[PDB]
Amino acid sequence: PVPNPTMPVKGAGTTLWVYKGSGDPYANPLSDVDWSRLAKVKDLTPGELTAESYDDSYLDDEDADWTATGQGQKSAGDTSFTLAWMPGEQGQQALLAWFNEGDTRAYKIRFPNGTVDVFRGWVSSIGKAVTAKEVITRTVKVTNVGRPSMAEDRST
Amino acid sequence: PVPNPTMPVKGAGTTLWVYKGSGDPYANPLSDVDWSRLAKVKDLTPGELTAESYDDSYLDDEDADWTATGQGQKSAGDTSFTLAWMPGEQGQQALLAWFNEGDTRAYKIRFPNGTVDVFRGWVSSIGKAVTAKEVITRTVKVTNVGRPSMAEDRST
């Protein structure tokens, strides 16, 4: 009802997709052609962008009472999510093949306000939890490579 | 005289039905085809629709003198009723099968003014009361799921 990217949104209805194309995943992320959904998402934690610190001090500085630093190398973090375990689904088979082969692939997060986030990465963890009274869950962690394509890139 | 939904009604003559068909229960609740009646009702407490609160406060709000909230998630509550205990009736056998299976089915309440309320739920309690001087009773509670179909939806 309110797909407004200038106002807060509650985030119910967020979807995860994985690329299966030979083109550029960053060129047109709003299109759902050649993307496959990962359904039944129970929990999602997107990667955090961070940067290291670089020392800017010299012996000749007239002011040395306070530290001075600069921005260093940047990182894209790890994305971690939980699905319902369904080995018969094609998406989870493709996820397991992605872990086994060791490729760096592109994936999307789509938010209810109408914006997408695109990352590239490789899988670094695959887990499971078994409890008598709860549905069995599949846990995934992806390490991101390079510069992502945030929503604010397409704000215009 | 003629039932009138724009005037108060006394409520003597209210009936309770459970769906057996395979179509849409919400499409035409005014028809009794594919519904089974639960006769000999003694008490009926319909489900209560409730909503929870969502906090809408920020640190940069100029005026924190008064609280500010909004409507959160909605619920349909539980519906309770009491019947004369007749284990040989097909309706009560179907009710016990509904409890044992554990699925979600549709049930309607039909009012003396010509209107109907439709809910979907699962049975969460089955009881009995035994007294020497009073007819043995069967007590049932149903937990409702989703958005019901109130009479005001069909007021057109």
User: What's the CATH number where B93 sits?
Assistant: 4.10.410.40
Cα separation, B126 vs B142, in Å, equals: 9
Confirm whether B10 is domain-assigned.
Answer: no
Full domain range(s) for residue A38? 15-154
Q: Which residue has the tokens 């940067």?
A: A51
Please give the radius of gyration of chain A, using alpha carbons only, rounded to the nearest integer: 20
Query: How open is the CA angle B59-B62-B66, to the nearest 5 degrees?
Result: 90
Q: Please give the tally of structural domains in chain B.
A: 1
Backbone φ and ψ for A152, nearest 5 degrees, come out as -65, -15
Half-sphere exposure of B121 (CA within 13 A, CB side): 24
Cβ atoms of residues A144 and A119 within 8 Å? yes
Cα separation, A106 vs B127, in Å, equals: 56
> What resolution in Å is listed for this PDB structure?
2.7
Long-range contact set of residues B91-94: C-beta below 8 Å, sequence gap at least 24 = B91/B18, B91/B36, B91/B37, B91/B38, B91/B39, B92/B38, B92/B138, B94/B18, B94/B20, B94/B36
- DSSP of chain A: ----TTS----TT-EEEEE--SS-TTT-TT--TTEEE---EEEEE----EEEEEE---TT-S--SS--EEEEEEE--EEEEEEE--TTSHHHHHHHHHHHHT--EEEEEE-TTS-EEEEEEEEEEEEEEEETTEEEEEEEEEEE-S--B-GGGG--
Cα separation, B109 vs B144, in Å, equals: 14
Q: Where are the beta strands (DSSP E) in chain B?
A: 15-19, 35-37, 41-45, 50-55, 69-75, 78-84, 105-110, 116-131, 134-144
Q: Which residue has the tokens 């500010």?
A: B68
Confirm whether A65 is domain-assigned.
Answer: yes
Cβ atoms of residues B10 and B25 within 8 Å? no
Torsion of CA A111, B72, B77, B121, to 10 degrees: -10
Cα separation, A91 vs A18, in Å, equals: 9
Solved how? cryo-EM
Cα separation, A139 vs B138, in Å, equals: 46
Tokens representing B54 are 């969502």
Residue A99's DSSP bridge partners are none
Confirm whether A8 is domain-assigned.
Answer: no
Residue A18's DSSP bridge partners are A36, A107
Tokens representing B145 are 């799921």
Confirm whether A9 is domain-assigned.
Answer: no
